[PDB]
Design a protein around this nucleic acid. Structure first.
Ligand SMILES: [Zn+2]
Ligand SMILES: [Zn+2]
Ligand SMILES: [Zn+2]
Ligand SMILES: [Zn+2]
Ligand SMILES: [Zn+2]
Length: 1752
DNA sequence: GTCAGCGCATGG
DNA sequence: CCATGCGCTGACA
């Protein structure tokens, strides 16, 4: 309820629970100090563990008695759940599965197979223990050992009774009840079912006590949600925008549920428009400017529209969702929603949820979902878990307070059944020995501190530069658009003009102000944080208030006309104030930007914050209410708002220097009078369009407030004046007003202020000078609230009560004052290096020792001797309580460059800093395991690993001191263990807080024609003159401290020397190998087989009989060749298919004497590679090495021969390739792996999710577990990519054109009729829902014919944009068929009109036939046999009424005509005209009728779309005709602004409908989502739909003869260029190849079109001028590579490859003229869309060399 | 095989 | 009659 104290901390929940039950104090002694033994299963979140732990702490604080518990083991099945449990809640044993627990041994998560420990006190299973194979396993285990208590839980609707009879087998009692989490302290509504089962009326007693321990919720859910600014929420919001940029719009059909949405929007009598998201068919959705729009774009049309329906259903009441925090779970249907019965609650967050937090405008992130389960998220470790995975983990989790209640009542009622160890003396001796050895070890743990500078002392010092300048910097540093979030910047800010509010261009379109760009030269928020922290004092104290001074103030306010105080209120308020201020120090916590920086100071009972408003900033003081103070107490009411405000002296330089002010609880109510003036406007409900009583009501546009002279004198700031409202500016209920002009004082607004959790009536109109959006736990300045029963209205004037309370009274007596505090850093880098020694892995070495004095009075218990800070569980909350000293410390930039020993051991494993990962086997399919012994040793030496950072705190004799300890040796040893003369390093970086990097290649240019020069970098690199180390390897083993802002690496690098390289343009390699010779000596080359023939020809042509050639090909050439025939021959060839042939592996197995049968292959192969080389060292090409190796098509290899190419050995190693797969780090590592360098190690986080899942069919289960357990950070990945880039600059060379090129882009507007036909086809394919035909074959041909008829509109090809490209290239309704041929323009359009008419008719008869079949069904049911509803009859009743229709009323009339052709009048006739047979059970027949009804509805919608498209086409043709018949339709406009008026401005026609109206008067209708005559059509209009008449053109603007405009312009181009130059034309569509061949034939020039005679046609081309060919042996005589529009493909990469290949056909070589490349483009057309999108994407994502452009 | 449509059931 | 359940199955790749 609310009468309870408000409780929001889990530990306090448990303290208030244990207080209820005083019978665990008696439990501890039957236990007699023995450790409890708890063994849970299948709970992924360990709420048994957490609840029992907090019970231990609560009981210790309540009664001084200590409870223990030895968590015996736990079971979890999926990998990420196992990783989470073993990373947060470390158990002894974590088993993979649950069935094996019957056995004596079972596998563990690491694979060790350690036995099942057996007897336990208590078992808590849930969330998978009823499946039943798993339940059989759990019963088997509970039969094997005897637990005296078992507690289960699962989803409620399940067979719990069946569970009872099953537990009857093992002779166990049983009892089950359902438990409501909303009733155990938590504001979240959920129901689950528990049972208790014990060996042989006890479970009855258990049920009674658990029913007893009930305590309702009393804190709104919003106290559990993290803020919307928070860094974790903002990274979760940037994930969405990043994914959207990395990633067309496939439309799921949802008709059966759209039926329910329509029934709801009609039955609830709410309007049919969509306010929050304005989604659209084949159109994006633009939510408000604060609403996570990249999450609104991803979700489906059903979810989005269901948000729409929920928002309207709430706006009926008066609540305005978007200002009242509530949660909606929109996964379920639309009729079965009670999204939050009480708005302060939260619905059951089911595992497959889609939640929407009403306020922040986005989903409950996974972490907040975990919080509402009771788990604390302050210290939670989460390592790359997806959102869906987190929602599963949280939803199936079980609620800590509920488990605690059930489990403590269980453990009390079943007290007597647990036996006792009963040796408390030995228990005390053991635990005390443990504590003593722990303390000795922790005192020893840090070493060093002898080399430490100990130099500075500082605290409470400032800089006090200039407060005016600081305020100017704040105004430009603060947050601007909601998408910033405490960092980053968003360019193109827009600032409103009245009520200056800001948003970027991207966001911030939707509630339109009068925007205009802002002149705010941005400044980096980190820099302002530096100055602000350097100006604040870090500890302050309020001083100078006594009871007598407070009394003096109260009588001063009484002396003036400021409202007096009731004496009891004065007593409570003054006592709380004085006790809070009295000797309590303020310390700095955090400063946060929310469009105005707030600096927050917290003391132990009062809390005070600095706000840097752009005008009159101040400090405000609010006092925390007492801990146990009921929610409806007058004291808690009084201590809500701040009581003390300290304005700041602007001209002065110091920050804490102003006068104080106090507010006494006056509570004065005066009367105002609100009037009406101005015109009338549509109310908010009517702007949402609700058709209840809220339809066409109105709202006044100017109020005026008058107040008496005495009241205005009493008020601090005057309140009269006339407030116009600002309907386009958005606030509470779109009710923001602005005061007409005192000039210095800030502008104040009269609007509505709703409380975040109250009812719909407690929201009262306010006055304020502050209108921003604010968090939970912050309150706005308020001048005077108004009565809550006043809203905007149409009435004239009322006298409503204005209640101004708490007049601000100024006191002089108060004042705010500030306050060997030394900190130590290591002076010298490399002093550490000298100080450190090997085998000193044990002891960290100090980095900082600070000492700042404290007091022993009321100081924390996080101080103590020393103490483990236990950072992995409490460091995040520790280094928050040390801001007041850490914020002063200089960042210690001295140690920022690596330095350490060298010539370290070339191979080592510490096996305490980095134990050896186990070894992998195979079964035979392939299934891999882990060694029992090796895996057990791995688990042991992994659980016992050293601490990378140590932080400890000490307080001995009221002086505070803490030391920071870092291990160097441990990072170094991890660095070495990563690697396969190794000189180590280490460095530390202070203060560290993105698109995939492009990978460029260094050209072979400006080096000692190109055939000669590119050899220079070849030979000298082959020799490697000098070059002791050509490449220096690396590894980095780095751990970081989150809060303080440090990340310390450790680098182990192996220098290596290697020869070779990679070149990307066979003609120079062969020109090289002859010299290098001037197995023993033999050079190998591997070619796929397509291209092996060219090398013997080329070597014969270049070198004449210089040597021997041993070219081979295919399998049966190894057996002929012997050693002395193969040898002493300079050039050898090979074919990559041979390494794929099984003969090669047969021979290799035989010669290697291995028992192999083609990752698995790459394992067994290298076993044989070790074997062969020993037999060859005694006295298949991979049994022997070479001097050189050259590969030609590295990209082509298919991992099966690629393995062999890696394995083969040689003295030198080269590559030839057209281009390598250098775009990605995995491929870069593959190239380097061939070259022989361990460039990096694979950590399975760097590849995208596609490639990760490509590999993750290989990984062992334990390896998936480890990959989720241990993750490495973004900076690590970036460093490794930088390393790969340096590798590229070293070794890979690339040869590129320049033979100049110049590109001429010819652009033109399409002539009128041709543009008109393109327009119609595009908007038709938009009106219908098909972007592409579907390839699946439907179950029923009665659906097949229908879907074919729908697909008819795509007569050309598959995707819609493809048909659009064909329309651009040449106008014709259908290319494929030659039945009708477009002789000219204005005739193809006639073909369109006829075909559209035919299709529309065919639609009508399909509708009639379906109606007849349905009527036959209805007759069958009626003949063969109250309350229940039969949807077809209501469909008929709805249809036969013309007045209630959505969609064009013309289509509605046509529907009436079709029904009356079927003869039904008002809904009643048994037979159908031309009746068919209606196919045994009556229920199945009813269901058939139902499905038929849905089919009719779908057909109706399709009819509506068809008639609208037809309307649009006839109208646009009318306009383009240009006659008086044309201008008549202009004269008939639903606007009323006719053209035949003295002003003749502009007209425009929509596209969704067809109507036409005043353009200026069209924009309003568009921006409110209403068609110009919405009584006529229900259009779903958006501002992109408007089309101005001047864009279309008029008939006969641009002449067209018999051909498409693009074809004509191509003809003109070829005629224009000179006659000697030859042409090459690229097409994309073969249909278009035919049409353009026709066009060029109709021209004057000849042409040549290009299976095996294609090369002959190329020979012919060497004749005719132009050879046109499809886009996607070298001809270069032609030098004009004309294009026809842009390529489109499914990927930017592939677009780049095809376009550069198409160019490289003609730009290749042998040009004595400058190659032109053209692109014909049509303005405002999808060719422009595709081309510009591809250019803009391609420039950033690849940065290739931009082709120069000129006019021609 | 991954995933969003699509639907009455059930104690208290 | 309220208030709260929380997944199986038939498209699509
Ligand atoms: Zn505004
Ligand atoms: Zn923005
Ligand atoms: Zn070590
Ligand atoms: Zn319309
Ligand atoms: Zn108009």
């Amino acid at each position: 309820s609310d009468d309870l104290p408000p409780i929001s901390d889990i530990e306090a929940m448990f303290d208030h629970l244990v207080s209820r039950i005083p019978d665990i104090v008696e439990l501890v002694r039957q236990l007699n100090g023995r450790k409890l033994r708890v063994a849970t299963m299948c709970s992924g979140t360990e709420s048994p563990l957490l609840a029992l732990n907090m019970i231990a702490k609560a009981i210790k604080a309540q009664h001084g008695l200590t409870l223990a518990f030895e968590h015996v083991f736990s079971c979890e099945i999926e990998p990420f759940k196992q990783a989470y449990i073993e990373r947060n809640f470390t158990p002894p044993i974590l088993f993979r599965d649950v069935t094996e627990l019957g056995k004596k041994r079972a596998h563990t998560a690491y694979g060790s197979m350690v036995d099942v420990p057996g007897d336990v006190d208590i078992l808590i299973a849930g969330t998978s223990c009823v499946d039943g194979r798993t339940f059989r396993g759990m019963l088997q285990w509970v039969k094997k050992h005897q637990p005296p208590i078992v507690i289960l839980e699962n989803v409620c609707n399940a067979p719990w009774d069946k569970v009872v009879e099953y537990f009857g087998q093992i002779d166990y009692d049983a009892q089950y009840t359902r438990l409501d989490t909303k009733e155990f302290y938590i504001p979240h509504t959920r129901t689950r079912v528990y049972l208790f089962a014990t060996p042989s009326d006890l479970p009855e007693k258990w049920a009674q006590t658990v029913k007893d321990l009930r305590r309702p919720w009393s804190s709104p859910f919003e106290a559990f949600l993290l803020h919307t600014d928070d860094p974790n929420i903002h990274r979760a919001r940037l994930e969405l925008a990043s994914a959207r940029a990395q990633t067309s719009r496939k439309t799921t059909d949802w008709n059966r549920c759209e039926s329910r949405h329509q029934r709801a929007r009609q039955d609830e009598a709410l309007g049919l428009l969509r306010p929050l998201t304005s989604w659209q068919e084949a159109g994006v959705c633009k939510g408000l400017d604060w609403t996570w729009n990249d999450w609104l774009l991803a979700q489906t049309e059903r979810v989005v529209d269901l948000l729409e329906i929920s928002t309207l259903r709430m706006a009926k009441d008066g609540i305005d969702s978007g200002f009242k925090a509530c949660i909606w779970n929109v996964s379920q249907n639309v009729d079965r929603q009670t999204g939050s019965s009480k708005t302060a609650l939260a619905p059951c967050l089911t595992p497959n949820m889609i939640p929407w937090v009403t306020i922040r405008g986005g989903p409950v992130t996974g972490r907040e979902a975990l919080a509402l389960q009771g788990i604390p998220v302050r210290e939670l470790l989460l390592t790359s878990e997806n959102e869906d995975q987190l929602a599963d983990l949280a939803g199936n989790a079980m609620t800590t307070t509920v488990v605690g209640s059930a489990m403590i009542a269980a453990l009390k009622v079943a007290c007597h059944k647990i036996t006792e160890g009963a040796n408390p003396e030995k228990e005390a001796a053991l635990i005390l020995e443990k504590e003593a050895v722990d303390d000795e070890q922790v005192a020893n743990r840090i070493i060093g501190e002898d080399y430490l500078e100990h130099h500075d002392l500082d605290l409470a010092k400032v800089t006090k530069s200039n407060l005016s300048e600081i305020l100017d910097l704040a105004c430009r540093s603060s947050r601007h658009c909601q998408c910033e979030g405490q960092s980053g910047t968003a360019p193109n800010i827009l600032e409103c003009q009245e009520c200056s509010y800001r948003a970027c261009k991207s966001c911030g379109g939707r509630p339109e102000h009068v925007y205009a760009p802002c002149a705010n030269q941005r400044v980096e928020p980190a820099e302002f944080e530096k100055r602000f922290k350097g100006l604040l004092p870090m500890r302050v104290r309020i001083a100078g208030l006594t009871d007598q001074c407070l009394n003096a103030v109260r009588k001063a306010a009484e002396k003036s006309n400021k409202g007096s105080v009731n004496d009891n209120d004065w007593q409570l308020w003054s006592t709380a104030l004085l006790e809070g201020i009295h000797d309590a120090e303020f310390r700095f916590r955090y400063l946060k930007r929310q469009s105005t920086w707030t600096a927050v100071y917290e003391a132990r009972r009062a809390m005070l914050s600095l706000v840097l408003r752009n005008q009159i900033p101040e400090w405000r003081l609010t006092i925390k209410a007492p801990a146990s103070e009921p929610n409806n107490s007058q004291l808690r009411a009084l201590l809500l708002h701040p009581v003390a405000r300290l304005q700041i002296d602007i001209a002065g330089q110091d920050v804490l220097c102003g006068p104080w002010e106090l507010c006494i609880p006056s509570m004065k109510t005066i009367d105002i009078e609100i009037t009406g003036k101005g015109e009338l406007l549509p109310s908010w409900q009517a702007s949402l369009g609700l058709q209840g009583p809220f339809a066409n009501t109105t709202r006044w546009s100017e109020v005026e407030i008058s107040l008496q002279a005495e009241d205005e004198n009493t008020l601090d700031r005057k309140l009269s004046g006339t407030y116009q409202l600002l309907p386009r500016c958005g606030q509470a209920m779109s009710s923001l007003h602005k005061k007409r002009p005192d000039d210095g004082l800030p502008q104040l607004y009269f609007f509505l202020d709703p409380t975040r959790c109250g009812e719909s009536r407690e929201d009262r109109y306010v006055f304020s000078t502050s209108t921003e959006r604010l968090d939970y736990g912050t309150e706005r300045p308020v001048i005077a609230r108004l009565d809550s029963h006043w809203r905007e209205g149409n009435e004239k004037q009322r006298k409503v009560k204005l209640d101004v309370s708490g007049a601000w009274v100024k006191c002089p007596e108060a004042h705010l004052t500030a306050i060997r505090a030394t900190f130590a850093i290591p002076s010298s880098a490399s002093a550490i290096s000298a100080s450190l020694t090997t085998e000193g892995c044990s002891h960290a070495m100090a980095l900082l020792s600070c000492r700042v004095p404290l007091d022993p009075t009321h100081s924390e218990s996080m101080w103590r001797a020393w103490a483990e800070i236990d950072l992995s569980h409490q460091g995040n909350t520790t280094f928050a309580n040390l801001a007041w000293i850490t914020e002063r410390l200089p960042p210690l930039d001295g140690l920022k460059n690596w330095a350490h020993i060298a010539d370290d051991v070339s191979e080592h494993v510490c096996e305490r800093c980095a134990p050896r990962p186990p070894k992998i086997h195979w079964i035979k399919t392939i299934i891999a395991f882990e060694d029992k012994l090796e895996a057990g040793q791995y688990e042991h030496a992994l659980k016992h690993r050293p601490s990378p950072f140590v932080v400890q705190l000490r307080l001995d004799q009221d002086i505070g001191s803490f030391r920071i300890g870092l291990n160097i040796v441990s990072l170094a040893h991890r660095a070495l263990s990563r690697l396969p003369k190794i000189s180590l390093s280490w460095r530390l970086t202070p203060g560290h807080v993105q698109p995939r990097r492009v990978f460029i290649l260094p050209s072979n240019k400006q080096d000692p024609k190109e055939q000669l020069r590119s050899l220079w970098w070849m030979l000298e690199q082959e020799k490697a003159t000098g070059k002791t180390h050509t490449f220096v390897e690396e590894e980095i083993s780095e751990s970081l401290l989150p809060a303080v802002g440090w990340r310390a690496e450790g680098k182990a690098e192996r220098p290596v020397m290697v020869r070779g390289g990679v070149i990307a343009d066979t003609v120079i390699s062969i020109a090289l190998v002859a010299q290098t010779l001037s197995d023993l000596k033999a050079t190998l080359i591997v070619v796929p087989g397509h291209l092996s023939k060219q090398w013997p020809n080329e070597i014969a042509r270049f070198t004449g009989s210089m040597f021997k050639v041993i070219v081979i090909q295919g399998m049966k050439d190894l057996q002929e060749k012997t050693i002395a025939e193969l040898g002493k021959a300079d050039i050898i060839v090979m074919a990559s298919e041979i390494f794929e042939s099984d003969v090669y592996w047969s021979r290799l197995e035989y010669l290697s004497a291995q028992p192999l049968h083609d990752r698995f292959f790459c394992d067994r192969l290298d076993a044989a590679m070790e074997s062969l080389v020993s037999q060859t060292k005694i006295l298949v090409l991979h049994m022997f090495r070479f001097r050189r190796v050259i590969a030609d098509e590295f990209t082509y290899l298919q991992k099966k021969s690629l393995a062999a190419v890696l394995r083969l050995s040689s003295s030198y190693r080269w590559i030839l390739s057209g281009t390598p797969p250098v775009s990605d780090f995995a491929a870069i590592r593959s190239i380097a792996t061939f070259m022989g360098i361990h460039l990096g190690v694979e950590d399975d986080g760097e590849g995208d999710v596609q490639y990760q899942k490509a590999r993750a069919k290989d990984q062992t289960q334990a390896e998936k577990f480890h990959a989720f357990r241990e993750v490495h950070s973004r900076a690590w990945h970036n460093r490794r990519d930088e390393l790969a880039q340096e590798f590229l600059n070293v070794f890979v060379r690339q040869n590129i054109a320049e033979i100049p090129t110049v590109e001429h882009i010819h652009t033109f507007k399409l002539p009128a009729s041709e543009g008109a036909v393109y327009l119609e086809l595009e908007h038709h394919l938009q009106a219908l829902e098909m972007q592409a035909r579907k390839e699946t074959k439907f179950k029923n041909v009665s659906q097949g014919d229908r879907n074919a008829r729908l697909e008819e509109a795509l007569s050309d090809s598959k995707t819609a944009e493809e048909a659009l490209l064909k329309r651009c290239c040449h106008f014709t309704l259908d290319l494929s068929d030659k039945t009708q041929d477009a002789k000219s323009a204005q005739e193809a359009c006639d073909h369109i009109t006829s075909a559209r008419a035919r299709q529309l008719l065919a639609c009508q008869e399909d509708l009639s036939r379906s109606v007849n079949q349905a009527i036959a069904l209805h007759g069958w049911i009626k003949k063969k046999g109250d309350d229940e509803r039969q949807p077809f009859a209501e469909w008929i009743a709805f249809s036969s009424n013309i007045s209630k229709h959505q969609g064009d009323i013309e289509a509605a009339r046509i529907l009436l005509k079709v029904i009356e052709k079927c003869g039904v009048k008002d809904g009643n006739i048994p037979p159908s005209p031309s009746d068919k047979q209606s196919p045994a059970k009556m229920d199945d027949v009813k269901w058939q009728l139902r499905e038929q009804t849905h089919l009719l509805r779908k057909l109706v919608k399709e009819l509506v779309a068809r008639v609208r498209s037809l309307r649009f086409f006839e109208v646009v043709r009318k306009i383009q005709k240009g006659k008086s018949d044309a201008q008549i339709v202009l004269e008939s406009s639903e606007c009323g602004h006719k053209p035949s008026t003295n002003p003749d401005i502009e007209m425009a026609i929509l596209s969704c409908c067809g109507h036409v109206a005043c353009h200026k008067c069209m924009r309003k209708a568009a921006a409110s989502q209403r068609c110009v005559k919405s009584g006529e059509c229900q259009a779903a209009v958006r501002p992109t739909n408007i089309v101005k008449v001047s864009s279309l053109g008029v008939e006969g603007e641009l002449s067209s003869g018999r051909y498409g405009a693009k074809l004509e312009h191509l003809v003109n181009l070829i005629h224009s260029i000179p006659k000697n130059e030859r042409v090459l034309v690229f097409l994309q569509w073969e249909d278009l190849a035919g049409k353009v061949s026709e066009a060029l034939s109709a021209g004057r020039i000849p042409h040549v079109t290009l299976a095996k005679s294609r090369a002959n046609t190329l020979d012919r081309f060497q004749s005719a001028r132009v050879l046109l060919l499809k886009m996607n042996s070298n001809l270069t005589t032609a030098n004009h590579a004309v294009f026809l529009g842009p390529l489109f493909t499914n990927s930017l990469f592939n677009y780049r490859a095809v376009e550069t290949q198409a160019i490289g056909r003609v730009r290749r070589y042998g040009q004595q003229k400058k190659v032109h490349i053209h692109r014909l483009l049509a303005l405002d057309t999808i060719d422009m869309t595709i081309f510009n999108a591809r250019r803009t994407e391609l420039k950033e994502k690849t940065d290739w060399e931009e082709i120069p452009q000129e006019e021609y």
